[PDB]
Structure 1
Amino acid sequence: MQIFVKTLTGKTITLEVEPSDTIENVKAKIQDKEGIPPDQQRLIFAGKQLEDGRTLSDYNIQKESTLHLVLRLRG
């Protein structure tokens, strides 16, 4: 399935996922695309900050959903 991750600039990236993938899985594919480490990612959906352990379907995230990405960048 396809989902969307949207950043605070409005930039929106398309991800290829299954409803069974964990959030860290989702975070991993993001890292591989834009070179951003998982610990520095925060994914929000429907007001909740998504936890790394839970499944995409656990948050009832379906085809063509949009996630929000906020970055806790470190140095």
Structure 2
Amino acid sequence: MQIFVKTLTGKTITLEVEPSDTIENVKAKIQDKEGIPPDQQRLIFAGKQLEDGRTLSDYNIQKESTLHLVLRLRG
């Protein structure tokens, strides 16, 4: 299924995922596309931070859902 990840730079990332994908898996796909390490990513659905050992299904993320990506760059 297809999900959309919207960033605060105003980019939409389209991902091909499955309901059983872990959050860590989704961050890995973002890392592949965008070169952002997982530990500098926060993913959000319906106001909630997605946690690394849960699945998309755990949060009721379904086809065509939109997530937000907030970066946490090191300083």
TM-score range, shorter chain: over 0.9
SS in 2 for 1:31: helix
Structure 2 distance, partners of 1:21, 1:40, is 19
Secondary structure of the corresponding residue to residue 51 of structure 1: coil
Q: What's the RMSD between the two structures over aligned residues? A: 0.8
The list of structure 1 runs, each at least 4 consecutive aligned residues, that deviate by more than 6 angstroms after superposition, is: none
Q: TM-score, normalised by structure 2?
A: 0.96
Q: Deviation per CA, 1:27-61, whole angstroms, max 9, x where unpaired?
A: 00000001110000000000101101101000000
Identity of aligned residues (%): 100
C-alpha separation in 2, matches of 1:66 and 1:73: 22
- Shift of residue 9, structure 1, vs aligned partner: 2.5
In the alignment, structure 2 segments of 5+ residues that lack a partner are none
Shift of 1:10: 2.0
Q: Can you give the 5+ residue segments of structure 1 that lack an aligned partner in the other structure?
A: none
- Equivalences, count: 75
SS of the residue 2:33 aligns to: helix
In the superposition, the TM-score normalised over structure 1's length comes to 0.96
